[PDB]
């Protein structure tokens, strides 16, 4: 029992975090095989980066895995990302695959500071494609993850903080999420919405975990919970949704459109001093998956 | 900026849990040195465990790391732990303590199955010594602790759920935490509190992240604060909690006997349908050192 926002183990990518140096700016990489990946804004001091990184060349950039420092022999840009190429092999580096992650899906967060890690928390890729991270000065570089067996798969690399305290960062391609710049500008959040199929997911935990309390016998239809989702700013539920959620329907006997049911209640008069999960709001950064690791 | 329920990095501590099996009976063990450590209610099929461990031999014992088998050549109990020699000396053993926590105080818990680690969150442990962790069938032997440099301090291994869904342990010298036991009973856990100091350290929190309107030109003594903590359930606010507060009251220039004027404003009236640091409820899972190692 119970229900813990859960990272992933973090080792296997603590074992590949290292501290890149270029000029008097520091900041963090990511070390597979025998490649090194940070930010690009390492290289600066409305900048064109590709002038920028013509100007540095492999002895610039100081490579330090703990106590060890590691020879760059090769440099280059891919997107906003730097792939500094280096003599050494990471001999700790685990099975991975560079994913891009959907707004609305949740992963591991390894915050990171001088290239050592510092803590580990989850964190969900919001509608408006910010994560609401917890983030300081040198954290860049750190990383976002998902493990599946043996597999890291990484998603995210920490850039920027937005000016609202929300954080904004890339793939493991340089390629950002969202409509972001890795350069100073008036650039800020868009409107967010909740997601709603994280909602249910969160609903059915509680179900799981004894909080009953919000449940009825009503049902409604998808096109009736739908209007009322776009008036509470809740993201439309699909039949894909509803289909994703069928284990965790299956599981409690509770359907999803009667949960639905449930979520319009909650939406419309609030919990009325009672909480769900020791919580007193509506939760939407845990995904169906999420529910089920913790909650078989 | 941000503020999230943040754990410490898990690897130093993924590579000491093995999987421990006697009998039909599996759970996770702790190997440090040459020695694994689990709870001794693996040796069960009201027992004497003196007697049941006298029935045992080493060969009753299987012990596997990963992939290999470690052989155990010794068995002890301690309290509720057993001890298990083995031949091998784990290579990656951390420096470590064994310290056993004060309530109030947080940890990371690395959740682990069949000798595999499968997830990281903090818990704080409660005023009445239960945690409210998120654990299954097979999680016993899992470990909580907290690192410091390189050194990683041992507070808590799990051995049981009580009725309400919350967990109880031991330290890891095998004494539990609170008025438990490791057989069936009917134990609960005991009434709760609200751990008042973490909650001031959560508000200092929301403030350094811009949460300012609960604030309040307004002060308090501490005995008339002390006064409305009693009636709300929350522990008394000592003079030492004040001090404790001293760094965070000094970051945002707000004085404790200030916050704690906005504090029972809070209890008194609610929230008024606002949210601090994404919560509608007042959160006591931080303490001061945990606010610090996130917002300094
Ligand atoms: C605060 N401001 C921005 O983060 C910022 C804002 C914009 Br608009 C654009 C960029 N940009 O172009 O990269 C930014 N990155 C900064 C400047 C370039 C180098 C990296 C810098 N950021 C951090 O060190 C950082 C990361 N996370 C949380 C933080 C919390 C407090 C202080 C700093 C951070
Ligand atoms: C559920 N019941 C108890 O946990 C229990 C209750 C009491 Br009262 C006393 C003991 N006792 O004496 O050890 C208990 N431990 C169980 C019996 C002895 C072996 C270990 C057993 N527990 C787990 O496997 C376990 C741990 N965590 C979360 C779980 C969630 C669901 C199911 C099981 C667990």
Redesign the interface.
């Known amino acids: 029992?119970?229900?813990?926002?859960?990272?992933?183990?973090?080792?296997?990518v603590?074992?590949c975090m290292v501290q890149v140096t270029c000029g008097t700016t520091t900041l963090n990489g990511l070390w597979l095989d025998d490649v090194v990946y940070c930010p690009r804004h390492v290289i600066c001091t409305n900048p064109n980066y590709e002038d920028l990184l013509i100007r540095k060349s492999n002895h610039n950039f100081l490579v330090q895995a703990g106590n060890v420092q590691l020879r760059v022999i090769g440099h280059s840009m891919q997107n906003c990302v730097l792939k500094l190429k280096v003599d050494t092999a990471n001999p700790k580096t685990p099975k991975y695959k560079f994913v891009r992650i959907q707004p609305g899906q949740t992963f591991s967060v390894?915050?990171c500071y001088n290239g050592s890690?510092?803590?580990?928390?989850?964190?969900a890729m919001r509608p408006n494609f910010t994560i609401?991270?917890?983030?300081?000065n040198g954290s860049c570089g750190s990383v976002g993850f998902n493990i599946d067996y043996d597999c890291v798969s990484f998603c995210y690399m920490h850039h920027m903080?937005l000016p609202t305290?929300?954080?904004a960062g890339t793939d493991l391609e340089g390629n950002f999420y969202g409509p972001f710049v890795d350069r100073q500008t008036a650039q800020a959040a868009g409107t967010d919405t909740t997601i709603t199929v994280n909602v249910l997911a969160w609903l059915y935990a509680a179900v799981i975990?004894?909080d009953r309390w919000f449940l009825n016998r009503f049902t409604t239809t998808l096109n009736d919970f739908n209007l009322v989702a776009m008036k509470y700013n809740y993201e439309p539920l699909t039949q894909d949704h509803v289909d994703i959620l069928g284990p965790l329907s299956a599981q409690t006997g509770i359907a999803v459109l009667d949960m639905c049911a449930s979520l319009k209640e909650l939406l419309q008069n609030g919990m009325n001093g009672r909480?769900i999960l020791?919580?007193?709001?509506l939760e939407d950064e845990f995904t169906p998956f999420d529910v089920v690791?913790?909650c078989?």
């Open positions: 029992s119970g229900f813990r926002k859960m990272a992933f183990p973090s080792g296997k603590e074992g390894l915050a890690p510092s803590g580990v928390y989850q964190c609401k991270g917890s983030f300081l903080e305290g929300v954080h975990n004894g909480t020791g919580s007193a709001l690791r913790q078989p």
